[PDB]
Amino acid sequence: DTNIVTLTRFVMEEGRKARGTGEMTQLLNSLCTAVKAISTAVRKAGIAHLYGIAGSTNVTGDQVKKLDVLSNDLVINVLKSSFATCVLVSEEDKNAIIVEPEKRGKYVVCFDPLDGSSNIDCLVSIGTIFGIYRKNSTDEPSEKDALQPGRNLVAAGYALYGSATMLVLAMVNGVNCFMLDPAIGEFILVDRDVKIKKKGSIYSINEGYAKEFDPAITEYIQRKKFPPDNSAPYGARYVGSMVADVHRTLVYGGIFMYPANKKSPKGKLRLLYECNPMAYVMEKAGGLATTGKEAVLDIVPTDIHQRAPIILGSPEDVTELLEIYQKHAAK
């Protein structure tokens, strides 16, 4: 009660013996500040009148909600002022952002300041997604610095603005969940070294796209509803906010899918600031994350707003689906 394991202490003790500049801690502390202010805004968005649109379009196709603008501004200002970043990639910005020379640090941060747009007005769970890379290059910081494979992630995670606000953070040694204490405004450790179940009993996907699904996804869903061995069918769940569906996948196990479809070769979700961070989390918790044909973290991107198909969750469920894709694979 008078010894609170906050995120800050955790990240600090973690990188102790393995010392370091400590700009990662500065990084994460900065981000926590922005997540608290996003949480506060969201918990009162109707009163504050933060519902609706801002009147702008993004890169390939999304409508800009007022909360997008607010949250994007927050995350950018605090990352910049942390002195730990040099390149920022945001879902809301067409180009990467280069931090002014005075405030530069060695990390590249890829983020979605607010994910789950369609669910904002109906008060369903939304969140913030981030991927953090070390800049390897020695040349002047640039967008190229963000075009790294997810395998190079040094830290990734999300803030879930659900019934409670939760900060899930994955680093080289594992995944830890921190819950926002609204009274003292600190993220406190509530779940340590989280591991996903090997097999779950929930499948999560938008069946509204059944007409566009590939034979592999079609066969898999059918198998979840009509199990060949007469086991109980899987329950369905699709909140519609990636951060919510993935978090449930993490703590309950199962599978989440946003696959490629007849009209979307590369799926819908964004590789840099949606799929890679969740892929990384999934794999640090002992799960898997695939496009159906290759590991998400091994893709080498060519576009910061590039899209990727993503199938993630319990290894045995992701693997059952990989087998179906392999079975269907053609010349």
Ligand SMILES: O=P(O)(O)OC[C@H]1O[C@](O)(CO)[C@@H](O)[C@@H]1O
């Ligand atoms: O309505 P759809 O096509 O299922 O989109 C849902 C997905 O869209 C997103 O809002 C991303 O744009 C994700 O949070 C969510 O998983």
Ligand SMILES: O=P([O-])([O-])O
């Ligand atoms: O807006 P989003 O993030 O895409 O959902």
Ligand SMILES: [Mg+2]
């Ligand atoms: Mg967004």
Ligand SMILES: [Mg+2]
């Ligand atoms: Mg998004």
Ligand SMILES: [Tl+]
């Ligand atoms: Tl957006």
Ligand SMILES: [Tl+]
């Ligand atoms: Tl959004």
Ligand SMILES: [Tl+]
């Ligand atoms: Tl998206």
Ligand SMILES: [Tl+]
């Ligand atoms: Tl998007």
